[PDB]
Structure 1
Amino acid sequence: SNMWVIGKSKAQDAKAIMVNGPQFGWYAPAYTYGIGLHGAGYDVTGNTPFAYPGLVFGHNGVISWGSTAGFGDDVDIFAERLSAEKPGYYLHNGKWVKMLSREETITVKNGQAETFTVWRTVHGNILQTDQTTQTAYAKSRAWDGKEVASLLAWTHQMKAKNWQQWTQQAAKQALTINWYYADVNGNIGYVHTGAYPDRQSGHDPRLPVPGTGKWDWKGLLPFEMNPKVYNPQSGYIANWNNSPQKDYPASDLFAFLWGGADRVTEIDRLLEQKPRLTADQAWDVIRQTSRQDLNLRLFLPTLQAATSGLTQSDPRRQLVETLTRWDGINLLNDDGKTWQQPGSAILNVWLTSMLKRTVVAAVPMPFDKWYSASGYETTQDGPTGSLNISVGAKILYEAVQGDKSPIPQAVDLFAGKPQQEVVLAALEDTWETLSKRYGNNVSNWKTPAMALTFRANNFFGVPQAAAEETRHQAEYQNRGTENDMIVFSPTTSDRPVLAWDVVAPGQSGFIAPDGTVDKHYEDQLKMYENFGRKSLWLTKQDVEAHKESQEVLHVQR
C-alpha cells in the first residue's frame, strides 16, 4: 500500500493534497465500499474495506485521512512448559495453571460434522505443541482485548477537526497501521499507530521466549513512543510499507525486511524532482510508480561495472546496454500482451541466477528456498498483490554494497570470488536462457507482460461471486486496489475541498434472480484501467445536484 501526502510548502494551487493506494489484491465485487454519512455529529464521504462502520479512506470537509499497513512487531510467541502428567496445565510463575479451552463443531454440507478443541493460556491461543519437548506455543498479540476499541477509534476519528482531536483517536487504534492526516489549512501528519509490548531486557523479538514467567511483557509502551511527525521539514510524507523511522524494528517475518533497497525510494525520487506539485501531477505519480520495474535502480550500477571491460560483441555486455538505455517503465505493445522492452525479463533471469549462486548457497536446505525468489514470480492471472523487491534481493543488495553496508557480512556470499566474476557468470546464464527462447536479435524480443485479475474468490480463497464474475485487465498495475485523492483549498474552485476516488468494478455487486445485473455493477471498470477517477461529494447541494435516486425510511427503535 502506498501514500503520498503533500503539504503547504510543496503543493501548487492548493494547500494540501493526499493520494492513497491501499493494496489489498483485486476482487469482484470490489474490496472497498463507497458511503457518505450525514448526521449525529458525522459529515463524511469516502470508501472503506468491507463497509466497516468507520471509513478508512475519506474526509469530513475539514480534515482527511488514509492508511498503509505498518508491519511493526506486535506479536511474540511464548513457549509454554507442559507436563506429561497433569495435562491441560502449564507452568506460570511457579504454579501449574489450567488452560482455557472450548470445543468447536464444524458442520459440513454433505459430510459428517467435525469437532475439535481450542486451547488458550495467559499469553494467547496455542498455535502448536511439541509433545516430545512438552512445549506448546502461544501466540501473544499486543492488541488482544482491543479489537473493538480499534474499530471504534477508526469511526470516531471521522469527527476530528484538527491534529489534537485526531491523535487522541489514533492513540486508541491498537493494530500496527500507519495513519495519515491532512487539513484545510495545509497541515499534514503521520502516526505509526498501534500497541507495542514493553519487553524485558534481553528479549530478542525475532525468536520465541519461554512462557514460564520471567520473560512476560511488562506492559505496553506509551503512545509517546509511537513514531509520528507533524508538518515535516521536507514538505511531504511518503510511505510504501517502508520503515516509519530510524532504528524502528520491523515485523519478525523472515521474508520481511527494511533495508537499503526499498521501493519507497521510487516515490521519493518523483516527489523530490519538482519543487511543487499540482493535484494532476500528484495523481500522475500513480501511473509512473504502477509501471516501474523495482530492481533496475538497485543493480544497474553493479551490472555496468562488471561489463565495462567487455567487448562490443560480447552478449553479456549487450544485455547491460539494453538495460542502460531503458528508464525502467514497462509499457504494453499494441498486441495487449507483451512488453515493449525486455528489461524485466533480463533482470528476472539474472536475479534468479545471482541468488542461486550467493544467498541460496549459504543457507542450509530447506531454508534455502526462502531466499530464491526474484520477486517477479506470477502466473497467468498475474500477481495477487503488489510487486516488491524480494528478501533475497534485499540481502544481495547489502552484499554488493561492500563495506558501505551497515550489516556485517559474517559469511562472504560471493565465497572468495570477486563480485564481477559472479555477476558475469549469472549474465552468461541469462543470455543462454533468453537467446534460446527468443533468438539472438535482442531488438525483437517480445517478452510477456503481467496481466491483472479481479478475482471472484476473496482473499481467504472463498467464493464471494460466481466464477464467471471474474474480470480481466490486460495491464498489471502496481497500484492501490482503489485510489483516492483529496485536495484542500484549491485555488481553482470556490469549494474548500475536492475529492475523487475509483471503486472498481463498481459500487454494486447485485445480480437479480433473472440474471439482470445492477446498473452500477461495472461502470467503474474502464475508468480504473485508464487511470481515471470520479468525484466524491460531501455537501448537500452537491449531493442533491448529482442525485440519481432517493429512498425515505421511517423507523423507530
Structure 2
Amino acid sequence: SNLWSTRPERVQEGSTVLINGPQFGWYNPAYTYGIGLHGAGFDVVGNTPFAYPIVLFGTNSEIAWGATAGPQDVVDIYQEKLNPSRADQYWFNNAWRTMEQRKERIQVRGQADREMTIWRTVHGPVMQFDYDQGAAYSKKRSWDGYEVQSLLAWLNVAKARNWTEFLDQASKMAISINWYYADKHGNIGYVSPAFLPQRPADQDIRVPAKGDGSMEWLGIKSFDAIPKAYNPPQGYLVNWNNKPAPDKTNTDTYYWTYGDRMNELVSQYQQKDLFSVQEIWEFNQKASYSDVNWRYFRPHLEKLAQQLPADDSSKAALTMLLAWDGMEQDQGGQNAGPARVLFKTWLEEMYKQVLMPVVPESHRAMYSQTGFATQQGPNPGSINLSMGTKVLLRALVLEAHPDPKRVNVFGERSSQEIMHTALQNAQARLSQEQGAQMARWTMPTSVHRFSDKNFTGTPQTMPGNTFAFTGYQNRGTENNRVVFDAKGVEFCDAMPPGQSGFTDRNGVRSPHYEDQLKLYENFECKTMDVTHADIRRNAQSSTMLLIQPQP
C-alpha cells in the first residue's frame, strides 16, 4: 500500500496533494465501494473497502485522509507447558491453572453439523497444540476489547476539521494502522496509532514470550510512543509499507532493510525542485513497472563490470544489463528485454549458494523465493523484496563494516566472487534451455488478475468470472487523488472495475459493472462530485425512501 502526499511548497500550482494507493489485491466484484454521506453532521465523499460504515479513503473539503497497513507489534504469543496428566491445564503462576473452554457449532450444507472446542488462556485463545513437546501457544492482542471503539474513532475522522482533532480521534485507536493527514491550508500529517504494550527487556521480539507468568507486559505505552510526523522540512510525506519511525523496531512479522520499495517513490521528489499535480499523479506509472530491488545491486554489478577484464569474462551480459531500467516493458506477451530474465535467474543463483546451506530446508522457501510477478498465478499484490534479497543486502553492509561478534553469510568468500559465479550460472541456466541467444532472452510478461473470490478463499461470485490485463501494474487495488485549490476540493479516483457487482439472473450485467476498468488501466481518473451543487446537478438516477426508526 503506497501513499504519497505533498504540500504547496513542492507543487507548482500551490495545492495540498494527497495520493493514496491501498493494496489489498485485485478482486471481482470490486473490493471497494464508493459513497457520499451527507447529513447529521457528516459530509464526506470517497470510497471504502467492504462497504464499511467508515469511509477509509475520502475527503471532506476540510481534510483529506488515507490509510496503509500498520507496522507495529500488538500481538504477542506466549508458550506454556501443559500438564502431561491433564492436557487441559496449563501453568501461569504459581501452579497449574485450568484452561477456559467455549464450544462452537458449525453448520454444513448437505452434511451434519460439526462441533469444535476453542481453548483460551489468561493471555488469549490457544492457536496451536503441541502434545509431544508438552506446550500450547496462545494469542494475546493489545486491541482486544477495543474493536468497536476503533471503528467509531476511525469513523469520526469524517467529523474532524483540523489536525489537533485528528489525533483526538487517533488516540482512541487500538489496532495498528497508518493514518495520513491533509487539509486545505497546505498542512500534511502522519499518524501510526496503536495500543503499544510496555514489554519486558528479556523478551526477544521474534519469538514467543514465556507463559509461566515470568514474562508479562507492564501496560500500555503513552501516546508519545506513537510515530507522529506533522509538517516536515522536506515538504512531503511518502509511505510504501516501511518503518513507522526512525526510533522504531521490527515487528515479529515485518522486517525491513535499507533496500525498501518506498525509494521508488521518494527518489522522484529529488528529481525536480517543483512539479505540477499531473507530474505527482505521474509518479505512479514510474512505480507500477519499476523493479524494486534493481536499484541496490546495480552499483555492485557495475563495479564488477568495469573492474573486469573486458578480454573474455562474459562481460557481454553485464553490458546489456546496466543500461536496463527497472521497468518491465513487454511485447504482446513476451518481455522486450533479456535483462529482467537474467536479473531474476541471477537472484535465484545467489540464493542457491548463499541462503541454501545456512537456512533450514523447512522454511528454505521463505528465504529463497525471488518475489516479482510472472504471468502464471498467483500474484499477491505488492512485489517488494523477499527475505532472501534483504538478508543478501545487509550482508553486503556486514562485509563492508565487519562485526567480530556477528556472523557473515558470505563467510570464506567475497561478495563479488559469488556474484561472478551466479551470473555465469544464470547465463549457463538461460543458455541451457532458453534459445541461448542474449538477443532473444525473454520471459513471459506478468498478467494482472481479478480473483473470483476474496482473500480467505471464499467465492464472491461464480467460478470463472475473472478479469485479465496485458499488462501488470504494481499499484493499489484502488487509486485516489485529492487536490485543494483556493477554488475548493476535487476527489479523483478510479476503483476498477465498477461499483456494481450485480448480474441480472438472465446474464446481463449492470451498466456500471466494468465502467472503471479501462480507465484504471490507462491511469485515468473519474471525478467524484463533492459540493452539493455538483451532486444536485450531476446525478442521473434519484430514488427516495420513507422510513421511521422505532425501537
Q: TM-score when scaled to structure 2?
A: 0.96
Once the two structures are TM-superposed, the CA of residue 292 in structure 1 deviates from its matched residue by: 0.2
Matched residues in 1 for 2:315 and 2:48: separation? Answer: 49
Matched residues in 2 for 1:229 and 1:487: separation? Answer: 21
Deviates more, 1:243-252 or 1:153-162: 243-252
Matched residues in 1 for 2:400 and 2:251: separation? Answer: 25
Once the two structures are TM-superposed, the CA of residue 250 in structure 1 deviates from its matched residue by: 2.2
Matched residues in 1 for 2:259 and 2:190: separation? Answer: 23
Which residue of 2 is the match for residue 431 of structure 1? 427
C-alpha distance 314-25 of structure 1, shift in aligned 2 (>3 A) = farther
Matched residues in 1 for 2:408 and 2:390: separation? Answer: 15
The answer (yes or no) to whether the contact 2:184–2:485 under 8 Å persists in 1 is yes
Q: TM-score when scaled to structure 1?
A: 0.95
C-alpha distance 87-324 of structure 1, shift in aligned 2 (>3 A) = closer
- Gaps in structure 1 of 5+ consecutive residues: none
Once the two structures are TM-superposed, the CA of residue 247 in structure 1 deviates from its matched residue by: 3.1
Which residue of 2 is the match for residue 216 of structure 1? 216
Aligned letter for 2:318? V
SS at match of 2:439: helix
Which residue of 2 is the match for residue 65 of structure 1? 65
Aligned residues: 549
Runs of 4+ displaced beyond 6 Å: 406-409
Aligned letter for 2:297? F
| Selected match of 1:374 from 370, 376, 388 | 370
Once the two structures are TM-superposed, the CA of residue 86 in structure 1 deviates from its matched residue by: 4.8
Deviates more, 1:354-363 or 1:290-299: 354-363
Where is the helix percentage greater, Structure 1 or Structure 2? 1
Which residue of 1 is the match for residue 360 of structure 2? 364
Matched residues in 2 for 1:123 and 1:108: separation? Answer: 31
The answer (yes or no) to whether the contact 1:173–1:194 under 8 Å persists in 2 is yes
Aligned letter for 2:527? S
Once the two structures are TM-superposed, the CA of residue 177 in structure 1 deviates from its matched residue by: 1.1
The answer (yes or no) to whether the contact 1:307–1:424 under 8 Å persists in 2 is no
Matched residues in 2 for 1:108 and 1:279: separation? Answer: 54
**Aligned pair 1:534/2:526, yes or no?**
yes
Once the two structures are TM-superposed, the CA of residue 181 in structure 1 deviates from its matched residue by: 0.3
| Selected match of 2:463 from 443, 463, 467 | 467
Matched residues in 2 for 1:8 and 1:377: separation? Answer: 36
Aligned letter for 2:276? T
Aligned letter for 2:462? A
Matched residues in 1 for 2:378 and 2:313: separation? Answer: 30
After the TM superposition, which residues 172-191 of structure 1 pair with which residues of structure 2 at under 5 Å, given as runs? 172-191=172-191
Which residue of 1 is the match for residue 327 of structure 2? 329
Once the two structures are TM-superposed, the CA of residue 190 in structure 1 deviates from its matched residue by: 0.3
C-alpha distance 440-549 of structure 1, shift in aligned 2 (>3 A) = same
**Aligned pair 1:505/2:503, yes or no?**
no
Once the two structures are TM-superposed, the CA of residue 206 in structure 1 deviates from its matched residue by: 1.4
C-alpha distance 258-407 of structure 1, shift in aligned 2 (>3 A) = farther
C-alpha distance 409-72 of structure 1, shift in aligned 2 (>3 A) = farther
**Aligned pair 1:83/2:79, yes or no?**
no
Query: Residues 439-463 of structure 1: CA distance to partner in whole angstroms, max 9, x if unpaired?
Result: 3432333331101001111111111
Matched residues in 1 for 2:355 and 2:247: separation? Answer: 25
The answer (yes or no) to whether the contact 1:399–1:405 under 8 Å persists in 2 is no
Deviates more, 1:147-156 or 1:432-441: 432-441
Matched residues in 1 for 2:525 and 2:208: separation? Answer: 47
Query: Residues 252-294 of structure 1: CA distance to partner in whole angstroms, max 9, x if unpaired?
Result: 12xx421111111111101221212222111111111001011
**Aligned pair 1:226/2:226, yes or no?**
yes
Identity %: 40
Which residue of 2 is the match for residue 263 of structure 1? 261
**Aligned pair 1:455/2:451, yes or no?**
yes
SS at match of 2:78: strand
Matched residues in 1 for 2:490 and 2:217: separation? Answer: 46
Matched residues in 1 for 2:77 and 2:232: separation? Answer: 36
SS at match of 1:319: helix
Matched residues in 2 for 1:161 and 1:499: separation? Answer: 17
C-alpha distance 517-125 of structure 1, shift in aligned 2 (>3 A) = same
Once the two structures are TM-superposed, the CA of residue 415 in structure 1 deviates from its matched residue by: 3.0
**Aligned pair 1:235/2:231, yes or no?**
no
**Aligned pair 1:420/2:416, yes or no?**
yes
C-alpha distance 53-404 of structure 1, shift in aligned 2 (>3 A) = farther
Query: Residues 453-481 of structure 1: CA distance to partner in whole angstroms, max 9, x if unpaired?
Result: 01111111111011232001111110000
Which residue of 2 is the match for residue 392 of structure 1? 388
Once the two structures are TM-superposed, the CA of residue 313 in structure 1 deviates from its matched residue by: 6.8
After the TM superposition, which residues 103-122 of structure 1 pair with which residues of structure 2 at under 5 Å, given as runs? 103-122=103-122
Matched residues in 1 for 2:403 and 2:481: separation? Answer: 39
SS at match of 1:168: helix
Once the two structures are TM-superposed, the CA of residue 406 in structure 1 deviates from its matched residue by: 8.7
Which residue of 2 is the match for residue 478 of structure 1? 474
Q: CA-atom RMSD, angstroms?
A: 1.9
The answer (yes or no) to whether the contact 2:341–2:443 under 8 Å persists in 1 is yes
Aligned letter for 1:262? D
Matched residues in 2 for 1:321 and 1:346: separation? Answer: 12
**Aligned pair 1:141/2:141, yes or no?**
yes
SS at match of 1:54: coil
Once the two structures are TM-superposed, the CA of residue 502 in structure 1 deviates from its matched residue by: 0.7
Matched residues in 2 for 1:171 and 1:406: separation? Answer: 42
Once the two structures are TM-superposed, the CA of residue 9 in structure 1 deviates from its matched residue by: 1.3
Matched residues in 1 for 2:214 and 2:442: separation? Answer: 61
